[model samples]
Target: NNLVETTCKNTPNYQLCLKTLLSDKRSATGDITTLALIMVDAIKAKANQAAVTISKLRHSNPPAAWKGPLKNCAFSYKVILTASLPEAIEALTKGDPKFAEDGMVGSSGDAQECEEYFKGSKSPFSALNIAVHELSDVGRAIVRNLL
Candidate 1:
């Protein structure tokens, strides 16, 4: 319980951070870096899901104007999920919290850019973006505490 309490301390949404991470029994005993890595993985997973969903919607010939935004979201998701998230994990593995935090910081804009495209309308991807954003923030908060 102390681990959960401490881990969620700097997170944007403390209760959600605590609940999500502690849902897994492994996090109870995992080190801070490992917990941060888990949150990164969760962020990547949600981004992946959003990309897949958006790809499906795009393939269905949604609209002409939707193409650019959807493509942007897809590309952003790929970069963040594949490149940035992995770099964060690698940085953590190497015991470089500053580098890990930097890796995460570079990725912080992805969901916001995606959300910008869907501003006027209610996008189905909203939930996924929120999940990714929250997880990323929580992961960054955990890594920040390492410094």
Candidate 2:
């Protein structure tokens, strides 16, 4: 359905959307639903990686004050991995893009929650959180097209 090129263009982060969809061979000919599902997987991978890194960082010797932000960051990422992404996949499979968008946004918020905790501090998760936020933005745009 030639959705990849045009659909990614509509996303908040155009390049990220295009790159992520292109990475999946199925997206070349896939429809809007396929694109949403692809974003689900992409977000899941990013969240999992973030959770692992945060977990390790939380345990390691870091700034004493940073321990609070680190704890919340790790907690948020775990929720994203376990709850948001899984629900996104389920919602997309059932043809409910709105609910899928909610799940994506939920993870997006989780990422932001972590970043917020360290707004005044040096955030180790700034880059990773930005990646999750942008990927979720891509997912949100794709699902909006579905709706």
Candidate 3:
């Protein structure tokens, strides 16, 4: 089990923080759609960083339930790309049922996957990160449950 914010925040001690550095900075396209996409991008960068930092920790393995493209690094990303922190948290807590019911969140090539649900043709154009944050909530739940 792993913590999203708290456990991640203790990276300096538990070494649970993973560093996922990205070349692409947060989105600057300056449009509604791009803003949403940037929200996902920023969150993604944080997650990437968390994974790398967590990897340095001894005997710390992220949960097996993490099913985003990043896998093992769900908690690594605590921020949402374009959404506010509260907005992101709310989405994580309440976003998935709809996505699941509609078959909108799953591995690529799976029928009714997020790619299909969001109708994303390219990278950030899709709701992958948005969905990922929702799924990553599972990791957050683990932390909450443990505490």
Candidate 4:
């Protein structure tokens, strides 16, 4: 019931984009700035939860090989928390669409990089890891529409 058709259309996770937008009341009245800001928060929360999951996984009976990988991922989520999220929010608010896009891309890249750190085989943390790119893809897609 909002103007998100084209925005969600370009994102990798169409369903996620809709699900994210629909969960927020402000989304009922959309604009590039507000939409971008909401996505920043969403990605930020996801990163926070990802860190918690990584922490729990580390504390659990995990494989020996995965320990370092998990630690590496922990840093990535920390990067999202301290750097990327703030950068995206400010870039969005400041009307620097490219900077906002760059910030989201950095967030997305961190997650993927974290997942890829599991060099022995497939990543066990894709549950939360891959979603970053998908959601950040939506973030960048919407923010890019501002330019």
Candidate 5:
């Protein structure tokens, strides 16, 4: 569980990070690179989940202002999954942690913006908001450890 220790050191939520990483058997003996892959995979899954939620919200006749935020969130998660995530994986594969570090920067801004919008409007996008934050934090924490 040394991997959990190291990975959790970089995360904001230490216990949750430890628990989540520990759930993946690979984290037991994997190197930092392996941990990075597992973390990225989890991040991708969460982003995909958020995107799906946003898409559902879009179709559910959301408020006019909410539409913009939802669309932005959906697009952001799409980029996080398709672009930033792949970039980090590629960088990690090449053993260049700096690039991997750069890969996750600003990746969560869209999600944060969406969250803020919902909060400001007194709406109920907390689930997607929380997922986005967790995914972003996990992605960054993994890269941070590599650095």
Candidate 6:
């Protein structure tokens, strides 16, 4: 099914990961979990704020011709936490650092990836430029395919 909205504040899988990374007793990995959580939380806050802002603007403008989506957009978020942080870091380093930098490696990364992707090379938007070239173009083909 297509998704119109997604969130992380209360996702089951995300909570599980958070605990895994924060459980003080668990010493299975390095400080990467801590670092990842800090970054992911900051990104999530920014995304949630952005979504709220978009909703406000949409309501404010109330486009006369606006009908439900020409096509539904699916959104999802994953997280990096205790048990999963190590593997996430491994993949980020091995596969593509941009995935991690964009915040998608474990969770919330996809949104970060898409925000930058959708903005293209436009000013201000391009300000968040990512190191991973392919990811920087995340939703381009899908949007093109839609048209």
How well does model 6 score by local distance difference test?
0.32
Name the runs in model 5 displaced over 4 angstroms: 119-123
Query: Can you give the TM-score per candidate against the true fold?
Result: 0.91, 0.92, 0.26, 0.89, 0.83, 0.33
Worst ten in a row by lDDT for model 4: 1-10
Candidate number that wins on lDDT, 2 or 6: 2
Q: Which candidate has the highest TM-score of all?
A: 2
lDDT of each: 0.80, 0.83, 0.31, 0.83, 0.72, 0.32
Q: Look at candidate 5 and give me any clashing residue pairs.
A: none
Compose the digit string of candidate 5's lDDT tens values, residues 29-116: 8897887777777767777777787888899998887877777667777777788878888988975877776656655665666676
**Candidate 4: segments with Cα more than 4 A from true spot:** none
lDDT of 3 by residue, 29-102 (tens): 23322222333344445444433443443234533422343332323232222233344334434553222211
Compared with the true structure, the alpha-carbon lDDT of candidate 1 equals 0.80
lDDT of 1 by residue, 9-101 (tens): 878889878777877776978988778877777777788898899899899988887888899888988888778888888888875778778
**Preferred candidate (lDDT higher): 4 or 5:** 4
Can you tell me which runs of candidate 3 are displaced by over 4 Å?
A: 1-29, 59-147
The TM-score measured for candidate 3 stands at: 0.26
**Per-residue alpha-carbon lDDT of candidate 6 for residues 14-59, written as tens digits (9 for 90 to 100):** 4433443344332234343333433344444444444444445346
Model 4 quality (TM-score): 0.89
- Residue-level lDDT tens digits of model 2 in 94-144: 657778878877887888888889857348768888888789878988888
Q: Provide the lDDT at 10 for model 6.
A: 24
Q: How many backbone overlaps does candidate 3 show?
A: 19
